[PDB]
């Protein structure tokens, strides 16, 4: 156990699985559904124009 | 919530001794000795002061609803 190689391996493997954070935070300033409704409105307008 | 005015069992007025009880406990007296100093002899009256929980102090930490 007192060998430096074993201690470094144990430290590396212990701290390797400690770091786990995939999702990244963000700040929403407006309604998330605004893009959907505005693009639906534009699509309906161009559908009417195409018809 | 707040200290009862009367003892439930016999009706002795215990509602005027809460602050004195807290003072005596502050000075370092034991709870039994503090109750003895307040002249609460019957254990029915001692139960009222010994087991009271002061919940109004928690209720007062919320901001008032009318100003």
């Amino acid at each position: 156990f007192q060998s430096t190689t074993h201690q470094k391996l144990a430290k590396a493997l212990s701290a390797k699985q400690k770091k786990e954070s995939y999702a990244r935070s963000v700040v929403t300033k407006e309604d998330p559904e605004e893009r959907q409704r505005r693009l639906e409105s534009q699509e309906n307008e161009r559908y009417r124009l195409e018809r | 919530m707040i200290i009862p005015v009367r003892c439930f069992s016999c009706g002795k007025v215990v509602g005027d001794k809460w602050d004195a009880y807290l003072r005596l406990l502050e000075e370092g007296k034991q709870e039994g000795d503090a109750l003895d100093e307040l002249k609460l002899k019957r254990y029915c009256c001692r139960r009222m002061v010994l087991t009271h929980v002061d919940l109004i102090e928690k209720f007062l930490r919320y901001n008032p609803l009318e100003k």
Binding site: - | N63, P64, L65, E66, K67
Partner: protein
């Protein structure tokens, strides 16, 4: 005609059944009705 109170800043105002339900000054969406004026009596028992 009817008094209200804001749920956040405790401000008093009135509504005429046509304004949006909002606080005037801090814009909270939660308001409470004020206590009535009728006489209130209890039997102390």
């Amino acid at each position: 005609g009817v008094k209200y109170t804001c749920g956040a800043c405790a401000h008093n105002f009135s509504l005429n059944k046509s304004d949006p339900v909002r606080c005037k000054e801090c814009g909270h969406r939660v308001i409470y009705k004020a206590r009535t004026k009728r006489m209130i009596q209890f039997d102390a028992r």
